[PDB]
Each structure stands twice: as C-alpha cells, then as structure tokens.
Structure 1
C-alpha cells in the first residue's frame, strides 16, 4: 500500500452518565479519530488519549502534534506501507504509543479492507461472540452504586469491575458482595491509586473473593506490585504498567502480575496487542480486553481482539449504549451478555457521518 493522507478529526461525545475514576470525573469524551487514505480505500483510527494526561502522559493535543508533525509524515514518506511496517517506520520516535496505535489502526483497517479480511481474522479470532463485563465508576454513595451495579447486572453483564480509590475500597466492595452475592464476577481497579504502604488496606479485600485488583500502584512500580502480590490474596492485574509485550514478559518473570489487561492503544497498536496476548498465553497468564470508552470504531476492533483464545476473562467490552446514547456506527448490542464479532472486512464497521459530523469538532487533512 501507499499512504495518501490522513484526515484528523476531533470528536466530542457526551457521556450518558459521568464516569468517575481515581483520576477524575468524566461527563464528555474528547476523542481523536483518524482517516487513512490509500490508493485502494480508507481506514479508520481511534486514539485512546484523553483531554489531559491523567491515565498516562499522553493526551489528545499531544497526540495530534506528534502525529501531525512526526508520525503521519514518516509514513507518508514511505514507499510501501504495511501496518506491520508502520512500527519500524515510527521506531525513531520515542513513546506515544496511543498515537502510533491509532495510526496503525487506521492503516490496518484499510489493508484488511483491501484483502477483504476482518480484523478478527487477521488477529486470529476463533470465537464469534464475546462475553462482556462492565466497568463501574466511583459513586458518591452506596445505594447509588448498589443501584447501578444491579442495573448493569440486569441488562446481562457477566462481570463487574468496580472503580476504587482510597476511601472507596472495601466498603463498596463489601456492599456489592453483600447485595448481589458471591457468585458474581467481581474485580476492582485503582488506576494507580495506592502505594505499597497501603498494602494492609488492600489486604482488607482478601475476604471478598475478587478476580483481581487492577493497577493498585504506579505505572512504573512493577517490583512494588510483585511485593504487593506477596502481601495480598487478590490476584494482581496490571494495566498501565503493561506498555508492551516485553513489558508483560518482564512483569511476569518478576512475579508482578497474574492476569493481564490488554489495551491496544496503551501498548501501541492492535498488533503489539496480539503479541502481548501471545506472550501472556505462553506464560499461562490469562488476558482480558480493557476499555478506553471508545466509539463503535475502537469497540469493534476490541471485540475482534477480545475473541482471541487467551481472552479467558470478560473484558471491558461493554455495549455502545453503556456510555453513548448515539454511536457513530451501528451500535453494539448486548445479547446474552455477549457481543458479536464483526464479520466484514477491516473493522467491519464504519461511521455514519450525520452522527459523525454532529460530533466532529475539527478536521485536518495531512497529506503529500
């Protein structure tokens, strides 16, 4: 393939309900889409960055810039372009995983669409549908939470991920275990909220029988996690720390993680994503698909990813309507708590421009 150009868009989709994390509350999502233009056709790219640098150092505007000025050009200046080759191409640029991911993603979609292959196919899906769970935010109250949860449970969600933070741990958890029962798939996420010194606190959850605890400490603190693993009964799950397959290997080898959360953007692309899956698999480490509150575009790729064999745990692959009233693509609909893997070439999904333009906030064509 030959890269024709990339149209960058800024989108702004308003969340159904504000989603509060250890890093801040969210009322509206500010995304960053990519339209890759080839000889053949075009591909879509979705950047998991957010307004500001609060989950990671990467943020919407930073991405634009790097993309614009560094990334996109690099590829454009290439003869042959293969999503594979994208990586090596961009190698001289340190970091910006979410940005290259999105880029790669756009390219990939084009290529698969040209060979008429689905994402899944490329990634080697074996499954047709995927079990979905949901990620529940920090409530201002119990009942509030108890309610939502029950709500989600009702719609068919198989598992529950509770957002935690100091002061929002044990209680919430205790309360949900209590109401809903013990046969409920339950896990927590601290989005780096704690410290090794908070061990005892997190030790407090031991009793609850959670599947795992996601990123209790900083992104850089692998050893801390391994130590931590030593002090608590809850299986460590790493997110933030998993920036690559190598990273996953390292953390595993160090006994710092038992289950890994896969976020295609975080790791720099669906391809790396696949590798992390592989790596994990080879080490007998279950993996699961993580969510960045994406559109039907990220959601579709995820769903395909998530249908890979080692995804033995329900991912954060919730129905479109969990966050968005109006998706810019055919929405995703829970069905017996599952989501159907997209059968058509590339993502097997595309945006509906009215929907699209209504949400678009800006645009920019980057070309040769």
Structure 2
C-alpha cells in the first residue's frame, strides 16, 4: 500500500467509576487515535499511552510529537508499505513502542481490510470467543472493595485481579478470600510498587492460592524478580518488563517469570505481541491479554489476540461498560463470562462518527 496520510486525534472519555492503581487515580481516559489513509481505504489504530509518564516513559503528548515528526514521515517517505515493513522502516528510532504499535495497528487494519481478512485470522485465532476477567482498583475501605468484587462476580466475570500497593495487599486479599471463598480465580497487580526488601510482606500472600502476582518490582529489575521468585510461593507475572519477545525470552531463561501479561502497545504492536505469545508457548509459559482501558478499537484487536492458543488464562479485556457508559464503536458485551471475537475485515469494528466527534478534543492531518 502507499500511505497517503494519517489523521491523529485526541479523545477524552469519562470513566464509569474512578480507577486507582499504585501510580494514581484516573477518572477520564485520554487517548490518541490514528486513522491511516491509503488510496484503497482506511485503518484505525489506538495508542495506549496515558496523559503523563506514570506507567511507562511514554505519554500522550510525547507519542503525538514522535508520530508527527518522526514515525509518520518515515512511513510517508517509503514506496510500498506493509504492516511487517513498519518495524524496519521505524527501527532507526529508539523506543517509542506504544506510538509505533498504534501506527502499526492502523496500517495493519487498512492492509487487512483490503484483503477482507480479520485481525483474528491474521494473528492465528483458534476460538470464537474468550473468557474475561476484570481488574479492580485500590479502594478507600475493605467493605467498598467487597461490594465491587461481588458486583463483578454477579455480572459473570471469570476472574478477579486486585491492584495492590504497600498498605493494601494482604488485607484486601484475605478479605476477598474470607467473603467469596477459595474457588474464585484471584490474582494481584503491584505496577512496580515493591522492592526486593519487601519479600517478607509479599510472602504473606502465599496461603491465599493466588494465580499470580503481577509486576511486583520495577520494570528494569529482572534479576530481582528471579530472586523474588525464590522467596515467595505465588507465581510471578511480568507486565512492564516485557517490552519485546527478546525481553520475554531473557526473563524466562533467568527464572524471573512463570506467566506473561501481553499488552500489544507495550511491546510495539500486535505483530510483536504474537511473537511474544510464540516465544512464551515454546517455553511452556502461559500468557494472558492485558488491558489499557482501550476504546472498542483496541478492545476488538485485544479480543482477537486473546483467542490465540497459548492464552490459557483469562485476560483483563472486560466489557466496554466496565469502563465506558458509551463506547465509540459498537460495544463489547459480556455473555456467559465471554466476549465474542470480531468476524469482519480488519479490526471488525470502526468508530461511529457522531460518537467519536462528541469525544474528540483535537485533530490534525499529517500528509
């Protein structure tokens, strides 16, 4: 394809309830969307950056700037483009994985629409729907946490993940176990909030049968996680540290991880995400699909990815209404604890123009 241009938009979508993590509290989701335009048709991408660099070094204004001044111009200057060629065309730019992933996603959506092929088919889907868990934030009190968890369990979510941080770990876990029992699939996520010195506190999670503890230590501390896995019984899962398939392989060989959370944007796109999946499967490491509170666009791509064979644990791809009263696409609706994999060409969904215009704060054409 020849890329004619890309429209970049900033969108703001209010959340149904505030979402608190060890790095802070979010009440509105601000994001960047991309519309890649080729002579044949268009494709949509979604950046998973947030407003500030609190989860990783990338953030919305930074992703916008790098897309406008470096990444989109490199793609416009090439003759033929394909999604696979996006990686070597952008390889001279270090990092900026989320931005590159978004751009790749838009290119891939346009390419696959031209071949009348779904994301699911391109990625190697083996099932038509996927079981979905839910990620539950840090709360002000224990009774408020139990109400929220009970609510998600009644809606049919198959697994519960709790955000944890120092001063909110063992108690919320103990309380969820006391109230809802030992058969609920339960896990925790620290988003880098601990150090190796906290190993005795994290070992106090041992009796509760957690599936995993996700990213207890900082992003760059892979050996620290391997040392941590020698001191605790709960399996380690990595999120932030898994920036590439090579990073996954390294972490696996060092003993730092037993389960991997795959987030396509974090690894530089859906094509790298499939490679992470395949590296993990080859080492016997189960994977599950992460969530960055995406719109229906990212959600649809994630649901497709999550239908791959080594996604053997429930992902964080919850229904649209877990986060948004009104999505910009046709919404994802939970049915028997599952979401259906989209069947149309490309992502299988597209923004509803009037809904997208209501939440658009800015736009620019790069061409």
Secondary structure of the 2:335 match is coil
Q: Give the distance between the partners of 1:111 and 1:132, measured in 2 at CA.
A: 28
| Shift, 1:91, TM fit | 0.1
1:75-109 deviations in whole A, cap 9, x for unaligned? 00000100100000000000000000000000000
Distance of 1:4 and 1:258 partners within structure 2: 43
How much has 1:310 moved relative to structure 2? 0.2
Q: Name the SS of the counterpart of 2:300 in structure 1.
A: helix
Q: Distance in 2 between matches of 1:88 and 1:140?
A: 47
Q: CA deviation at 1:279?
A: 0.2
What displacement does 1:39 show? Answer: 1.2
Alignment partners' CA distance in 1, 2:150 and 2:182: 14
**Secondary structure in structure 2 of the residue aligned to 1:139:** coil
Q: Hey, what's the Cα distance between the residues in 2 that align with 1:241 and 1:202?
A: 19
Length-normalised TM-score, structure 2? 1.00
Distance in 2 separating the partners of 1:221 and 1:161: 23
Shift of 1:337: 0.6
Report the counterpart of residue 365 of structure 1 in structure 2.
365
Tell me the secondary structure at the aligned position of residue 71 of structure 2: helix
**Post-superposition CA distance 1:6-31 (Å, at most 9, x none):** 00000000000000000000000000
User: Which sections of structure 1, spanning at least 5 residues, go unmatched?
Assistant: none
- Report the Cα distance in structure 2 between the residues aligned to 1:237 and 1:311, rounded to whole angstroms: 14
Show CA shifts across 1:204-260 (max 9, x none). 000100000000000000000000000000000000000000000000000000000
1:360 to partner: Cα distance: 0.3
TM-score, normalised with respect to structure 1: 1.00
Q: What is the deviation of 1:353?
A: 1.2
Determine the C-alpha separation between the residues in 2 that align with 1:69 and 1:127: 40
Moved over 6 A (4+): none
- CA distance in 2 between counterparts of 1:248 and 1:40 reads 37
- 2:133 matched residue in structure 1: 133
Query: Considering only aligned residues, what root-mean-square deviation do their CA atoms show, in Å?
Result: 0.3
Unaligned runs of 5+ in 2: none
TM-fit CA distance, 1:196: 0.2
State the Cα deviation string for residues 248-283 of structure 1 (Å, max 9, x = none): 000000000000000000000000000000000000
**Distance in 1 separating the partners of 2:356 and 2:181:** 41
- Matched position secondary structure for 2:315: coil
Task: Give SS of 1:12's match.
Answer: strand
Matched, 1:345 2:364: no
Question: What CA deviation, in whole Å up to 9, does each residue of 1:83-140 have, x standing for no partner?
Answer: 1000000000000000000000000000010100000000000100000000000000
Partner residue, 1:196? 196
After TM superposition, give the deviation of residue 147 of structure 1 in Å: 0.4
Instruction: Provide Cα deviations, 1:262-306, integer angstroms capped at 9, x if missing partner.
Output: 000000000000000000000000000000000000000000000
